[PDB]
């Protein structure tokens, strides 16, 4: 008995899918998934941000699935609700590509989706067995802007855990990696990145949380870059997402 | 039945033991206090951050409590946890008296203090009734750098509500004066300042959440200036602290 914690989807409908489809391959054998949580960010770079909301959608009518927002769906979201163009995010410190990133996901939502990431939860505050844990996707301290790195000593996420002691594990999505870290305030968790390459190689990458102890299982799956390449350059979007694609980079 | 919230006593024991006093007496005259919530910023600008602790570590024995840590608390448990001195107060981006009340507060504390504000959480998670409470300092978008505003328009608090929407409450201490907002996701509160002057003539202010209902209940409660005044004086903090307890600022 498992709970499926995905992160980072990041508008990559292509690894979205191979991750969940690899979860029905493993229920085939043997393992159990009681539900789901999803981690922002749910769109971002990639282009099939409304393809991505109606697989989640499908999902959360069939299974037990909580989900909460991340930096790039917080730009959206936080847009007044009556604007025409997505001219607003010129004027934030961002990257340009990324701009171009994200004003194309604005535009390709409608109103629709851009009014499903506002009903998007901040945070994630749940049981699984008896233990409580909670989740947000950059850190404690700073839910959007926050950062908790990977490969740190136990002493760095002890102090992380620290002002979330109440509970008996914290999710994260911003290391980005796999992270696994049992700490005298409970276990700090990063089920890594579905969707946002962090660096070469990139396979979506995922965590089965067992119900009884919190030890998560990583899971890495390979995906089809080829059509994601060929779906930036048809929707004429930055030759810098192409780069972070195969090369990786930080949202 | 009742619930007792307080914010913002930032260091200001009359101010604390008057509300505190207050809350006995309407024991005495038959009102059902049942539990406490205790919002940051529990130290900060006035000099009495020792004592403080001491009443809430002494009523935390006694009663139901839950407390939370401010904006300020932050600042001091953030430092390195063997540093010899409050030098990097003056590196941040802090009016100058605000700096000078830290670097006496974190000097005041000892290691003792210093670690008390390091176990304080930063969210308050609860059920009051069979109502599913959330809160935290600042805003839900950003625990110690956000503010919401008091005196804004119904819209306003609604769409502060949408991320929390799970929840029938919302509380936090940055209005520094009395907030009640019912949106169609829920109740925006913010329970006024204990020991935070926002403006002249200022009294201890704090809200008893009916359990059934969560209509607050505000509460303004006198306390004597002046032997604060004298503190301060005779402390060698500055005379901008003076016009803050007589004429009101912001943290
Ligand atoms: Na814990
Ligand atoms: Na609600
Ligand atoms: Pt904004
Ligand atoms: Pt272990
Ligand atoms: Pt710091
Ligand atoms: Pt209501």
Redesign the interface.
């Given at each position: 008995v498992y709970v499926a914690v995905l992160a980072n989807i990041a508008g990559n409908l292509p690894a979205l899918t191979a991750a969940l489809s690899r979860i029905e391959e493993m229920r085939e054998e043997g393992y159990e998934i009681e539900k789901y949580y999803i981690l922002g960010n749910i769109v971002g770079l990639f282009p099939y941000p409304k393809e991505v909301i109606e697989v989640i959608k499908d999902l959360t009518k069939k299974e037990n699935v909580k989900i909460i927002?991340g930096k790039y769906d917080?730009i959206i979201?936080m847009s007044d609700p009556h604007a025409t163009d997505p001219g607003y995010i010129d004027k934030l410190e961002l990257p340009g590509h990324v701009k171009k990133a994200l004003k194309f996901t604005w535009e390709k939502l409608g109103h629709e989706g851009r009014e499903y990431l506002?009903?998007?939860?901040?945070?994630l505050?749940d049981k699984i067995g008896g233990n409580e844990v909670?989740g947000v996707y950059g850190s404690?301290?700073?839910?959007?802007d926050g950062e908790v790195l990977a490969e740190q000593p136990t002493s760095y996420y002890e102090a992380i855990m620290?002002?979330?002691?109440?509970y008996e594990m914290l999710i994260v999505a911003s290391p980005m990696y796999p992270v696994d870290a049992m700490t005298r305030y409970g276990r700090v968790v990063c089920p890594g990145s579905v969707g946002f390459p962090p660096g070469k190689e990139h396979k979506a990458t995922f965590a089965l949380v067992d119900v009884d102890t919190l030890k998560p299982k990583f899971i890495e799956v390979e995906y089809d870059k080829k059509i994601i390449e060929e779906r930036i350059r048809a929707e004429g979007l930055p030759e810098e997402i192409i780069k972070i694609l195969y090369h990786g980079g930080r949202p």
């Open positions: 927002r917080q979201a506002r009903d998007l939860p901040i945070y505050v909670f404690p301290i700073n839910p959007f620290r002002p979330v002691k109440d």
